[PDB]
Subunit: 318 residues, 4 copies
C-alpha cells in the first residue's frame, strides 16, 4: 500500500505510544522542505525578472525556523545560517532541539549543483533554561536525522531507530511518497568521493588509502571517482550505490571542514542506521562531544568494508 | 524587459529575416524539455506507487515526437537509437538534430543532475534524408545547447549571437532569460575528470593533473569537482571557469563520450562563450564524423586551461 | 502562526486527547483531495494528447478516496456515490470510522470546466456488530466531521467539526492546505437565491411562492440576485460565503428531491449548521432524517437562517 | 500529432505569410494567462500567511506588461483602467488590444470561475496612437477569445480560421490543443441569465423566458444555469449549447456588460463558432462604440436559440 511521510510518521508514532510531538515537528519540517524545494526549482522566478512590470539560503532558513517554532515541538534551534542558537519563545516551546543546514551546498547553487536540507533532532536533556548548551549533545543521542535532496528529483531520507526510509516528493501533489524502505548500504562499494584538489595537504593515511583505490594492491579493478562538492549529493549517492565519502582535515581546515552538529552528525546517524560507518579517523562521528555549535569535524563515511579498510590504513600510520 | 525563450528565439528570427522554421523547432524542443523536467522531478510518482489503488526512453519519446511534429526536421540522431530516425516525408523540414535526451541518467537512481544535450544542423544536400546528413563537423552547427535538470531546470542555448541561459519557472512553464550572452573565465580554478581511473591515464593527463594539484609555483592548487554527469560538469565549467576532461587513453584512443550529441554540442557552447574544446589533437568541432555514434576525446573549458593542457599534451606527443 | 490542515487537525486532536485515528483519516483524505485537484486541473493532459507519441475523473476520484481512506487504518465502512453497496474495509485495515462521500460531485458537466468538488461526512461505527451497510444508516446529527473540497478558481477544503467551520486554501506550489478563514459563520440573511428555475412548471406551490417573493418583494425591499452554478459544491460554498439560500426541493415528479442524503445533503447540512445556518427538507431538519437506504434522496433548502425560516413560513402556509 | 498554442499560432502565421508580430502578441498573452492561472489557483498563498515568518490588479499588470514588451501593441484598453494605455514609442507595434484581465473577480471570494477576455484589432492609420483607435466595431476584430480558470484552465482562441480550444497542462506550463475548429450546437437546452432582475425585464425577455419554462411546442423545459461569471457562462454555452443573456434593466439601462472587452470578444468567438450575439436591435459586432467603457446588452449562443429570442423581440418592436 501507498505510504506517505505523514502516514508513516504517524504510524511509527502510534506504535511507539508517543504523544505525537515528534510527528508535529516532522510534519512541520516536511512542509518546510516542500516550500524549500519549490523555491530551489525556481517557481515564480518570472516575477523576479519583471513579468508583471530573499536570497535562497536566507529564505530556506526562514522556512525551517518558522515551521519548527510554530510546531510547538522545539526549544532550541541551531542553524548553519545563524551565529548563535535560536531559543524558541516560551509559548511555543516543546521538548526537541534541532540542528539543521537549511540549504547545504548553496554556496555553488549558481551552477545548479544539487543542494540539500540536513537535519538532526535531539530530545532536550537538561532541565535548565533552554540555551545553546542544549545542542551540544553527541550524535549518539540523536532521536532522528536525515536530509532532503533537491537533485534531479526531491527526496527526503529519514533515519530513526526503526531504520532508514526514503520518500520521493511528488510535486504534482506535494506529497512525500515512501519508495525505499528500511534501506541498508552495500557492505562494500566501488566509488570513492573527495576533493583530491587538496592532495598536497593530505596526511599520509588519506594519501595511501586513495592510492589503494586507484592502484589496488590485489590487482582488482580501481574504484571510480565522484565528487559533486555538495554533501547531501555525495552522501546520498554513497548510501544508494555504496562506497566511501571523505572530507579530511586540510591546512585550511585543520579541524576538518564540515560542521559536526548539522552536517556530520545527521549523515553519520543515517549511515549507521543503514549499516554503514562514519568516523573522524580517531573516533565515530557520533561519539564526538561538541563544545561549540559551529565546530567542524573531519569525516570518512560510507560502506563498512571501505571505512574499515580506511581505518586499517589510518592505524598503520598510527 | 522580461524575456522568455519563445520571445527570444522569435526576435532573433525576425532580425535574421528567417521563415520561422528554426523557431518552430526550438519551441518544440523547449516543449519537450519542460515535459522531461516534469518527469525527472517525478510529478505523478504517487500513481506508480498506488495512491489510486523508462525515464530515458520517455525522454527520448518526448524529444523525438516534438521534433518530428515541428515540421522543421528531417533526420534525428539520438543516443538512444541505433540508427538515425528519418522523419516522414509529410513532416520534413530542413534541419538535422542530434541529441542525448537524458545524459547522466545511468545513475539517476542516486538523483544526480541529468540533462538533455542537442545540436542542430542545416541539411546540406538535396539527397533523400539519411544518416549521412548528420555526419557534419560541429563547425556546421546552427544551434546547440543543453537542458540541465539540477537544483533548477535551465536551458543553455548557443547560436551565432552567443550563449544565452534561460531558467524554467515551473509555476508557468516559461524559460526566463536570466544570463545573457555569457562568456567563460579566461582561466579557472577547478579541474574535472574521473581520477579513479588514473592508472589508465595518458602520460600527458597524469602530468597535467599532477600540476593542478602540485603547482610548480606559489599558486593555489585547483579544486576538483566531478559529478559524472556531463551536462552538470560542463555547465559548472561554464559558470565557474576551469577544465573538464574526458580524454583519450590506450584502451580508449577515441575517448568515450559521443561526438555527435555530447562532445560537439558542448564544444560549440564553449566556443560561443569564448572557451575551447579539444580532442588533444584538434578542435572537437573540426572532427568530420564517419559514424553517428563515434566517440571523441574531449577537453574543454577556460582557454588558458585548455591551452595549458595542450602544452602538456604536446610535450608527450 | 501559519496553520496547515495537518497541524490544525493534530492540535484539535490533542485538545480532545484523541488516539489520532481521525487525524489519520483526515490526513488520508487530504492526500486524495490534492490528487483529485491535480487530475481536475489537468496535470499530464499533454500525455493524453500524444506529446510522447485514461480513466474518467469521477472514476479516478472514487479510486483515490477509496484507496486513501482504506489505507488510513481508520475506516470500516465506506459509502460512495459510485458504488451500489457499502464497501467493507478488510479486517487488517479496519478502523472505527464510517465515511460517506461523493468523490467528484458535479462532474457530469465537467466538460464545460464547471466547478466540481468532493463531499464527505464521517461517523463512528455505533454497533458492536461486524461492520456492514447498516452502520452507514445514521442520521446526520451523528456526524463527527463533514465537509467538501471545492475545485474552483482555487481548491479549498472546508472542514466542519464540533469546533466549527474552518476553510483551508490548497497551495499547489507546496501541496499544503493553509487555514485562511477560521470559525466561519454564515450571514443571518443573504441577498441571493439559488435553484434551477428552468423547471418552474414542476415547482411546489410553496417554492413557487417563495421564489416570487424573492423576485417581486411585497415590501419595497430590493429583489434578490439569482445564481445557480449547477454544481452543488460551488453553490453551497457561495451560500456559506455571501449568504442566501440554496434550493433543491421536493416536487410532484420527485417527492424526495434529487440530491442524495448520505453523501450530499447531510454534509452540507452539517457544515451549514456549524456555521450558524440552516438546512431543511421542508418538513424537518435534513440532519434529523434517519435514512433506510444509503443512496436515498432527500430534498434540501439551506443557507442563511432568516432565508430558510422565511421559506418554511411560506411552506407551512401551504401546509 | 500533439499541438500546442505556441505551435498552432506560429503555423497559422506561416500559412498567412505574416511577419510574426501577431504571434508575438499571442505568445505574450499566452504567458500572461499562465501566470494569471498560477495566481488564481493560489500558488504561493502560504507565503502570504506567514510560512516563512490585488488579484485583479496583478492580472492587469501581467497582461499589460506582457503585451507592452511584445513589441506588437500600441493601444491597450482594460476594464481596470479609466483611459486607454498608450504604449511608449520604443515598444510600439501595430495592434490594439481591449481586455478584461480577470472577468468575474468581484466574487472570486467564493472561488467562482473567473476568466480573461481579450479582443485584438489592427491599427491601419498613420496617426499617433490614441484612445480612439480602440473605438472600432467588433466586426473589425483580427482575433479574440478568453481564458477560463474553472476546474481546469482553458484558452479559447477565435480567428478567421475558426475557434480552437487549448487546455493548460500545469505539469509543463503548456496549452495543448484539445478541441479544433469548434462549432456550437444549432440549438441547446440551457438558458442563462440573472432572473433576480425579473421585475426589471423588458417584456420581450419576460416572454422568452416564459417559453423556456413552458414550451409552446410541448418540448422539454430548458434547464437554467447562471454562474454569474461571464466566461464560465459563455463557455458552458459554447460547449453545451443554449443561450446567454444580459439584457438592459433598471440598474443597467444599457446592459451591464462592457462592449469592447466582454461583449465584442464573446460575440466574435460565438460568430466564429457558428453562433450569434445580439444586442436585440443589431449584432453586437456591428455596434460602433463612442466610449471605450460603454455597456451593451448581449444575447448570445446557439443560432436557433438566438433567433427564437429575436423572434420574440421583433414582436414587442
Ligand atoms: O506520533 C506519535 N504518536 C501518534 C500521534 C499522537 C499525537 C498526535 C495526534 C493528536 N490526537 C488526535 O489527532 N486524535 S484524533 O485523531 O482522535 C482527533 C480528535 C479530535 C479532532 C481531530 Cl481533527 C482528531 N508520537 S511521537 O510523535 O512522539 C513519535 C514517536 C516515535 C516515532 C515518531 Cl515518527 C513519532
Ligand atoms: O524566427 C524566425 N523569424 C521570425 C519569425 C516571426 C515571423 C514569421 C512567423 C510566422 N508568421 C506569423 O505568425 N505571422 S503573423 O504573426 O502576422 C500571423 C498571421 C496569421 C495568424 C497568426 Cl496567429 C499570426 N526565423 S528562424 O526561425 O529561421 C531563426 C533565424 C535566426 C535565429 C533564430 Cl532563433 C531563428
Amino acid at each position: 500500500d501507498v505510504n506517505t511521510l505523514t502516514r508513516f510518521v504517524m504510524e511509527e508514532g502510534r506504535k511507539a505510544r508517543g504523544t505525537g510531538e515528534l510527528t508535529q515537528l516532522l510534519n512541520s519540517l516536511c512542509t518546510a522542505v516542500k516550500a524549500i524545494s519549490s523555491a530551489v526549482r525556481k517557481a515564480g522566478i518570472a516575477h523576479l525578472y519583471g513579468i508583471a512590470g530573499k536570497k535562497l539560503d536566507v529564505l530556506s532558513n526562514d522556512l525551517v525556523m518558522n515551521m519548527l517554532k510554530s510546531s510547538f515541538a522545539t526549544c532550541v534551534l541551531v542553524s548553519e545560517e545563524d551565529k548563535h542558537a535560536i531559543i524558541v519563545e516560551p509559548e511555543k516551546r516543546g521538548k526537541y532541539v534541532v540542528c539543521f543546514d537549511p540549504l547545504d551546498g548553496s554556496s555553488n547553487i549558481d551552477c545548479l549543483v544539487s543542494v540539500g536540507t540536513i537535519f538532526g533532532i535531539y530530545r532536550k536533556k537538561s532541565t535548565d533554561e533552554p540555551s545553546e548548551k542544549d545542542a551540544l549533545q553527541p550524535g549518539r543521542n540523536l532521536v532522528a536525522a536525515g536530509y532532503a535532496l533537491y537533485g534531479s528529483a526531491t527526496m527526503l531520507v529519514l533515519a530513526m531507530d526503526c531504520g532508514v526510509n526514503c520518500f520521493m516528493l511528488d510535486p504534482a501533489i506535494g506529497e512525500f511518497i515512501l519508495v525505499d524502505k528500511d534501506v541498508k548500504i552495500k557492505k562494500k562499494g566501488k566509488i570513492y568521493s573527495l576533493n583530491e584538489g587538496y592532495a598536497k595537504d593530505f596526511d599520509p593515511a588519506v594519501t595511501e588509502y586513495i592510492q589503494r583505490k586507484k592502484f589496488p594492491p590485489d590487482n582488482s579493478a580501481p574504484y571510480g571517482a565522484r565528487y559533486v562538492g555538495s554533501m547531501v549529493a555525495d552522501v546520498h549517492r554513497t548510501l544508494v550505490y555504496g562506497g566511501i565519502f571523505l572530507y579530511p582535515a586540510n591546512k585550511k581546515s585543520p579541524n576538518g571542514k564540515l560542521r559536526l552538529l548539522y552536517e556530520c552528525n545527521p549523515m553519520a546517524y543515517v549511515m549507521e542506521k543503514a549499516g554503514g560507518m562514519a568516523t573522524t579517523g580517531k573516533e565515530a562521528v557520533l561519539d564526538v562531544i561538541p563544545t561549540d555549535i559551529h565546530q567542524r569535524a573531519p569525516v570518512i563515511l560510507g560502506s563498512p568494508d571501505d571505512v574499515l579498510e580506511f581505518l586499517k590504513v589510518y592505524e598503520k600510520h598510527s
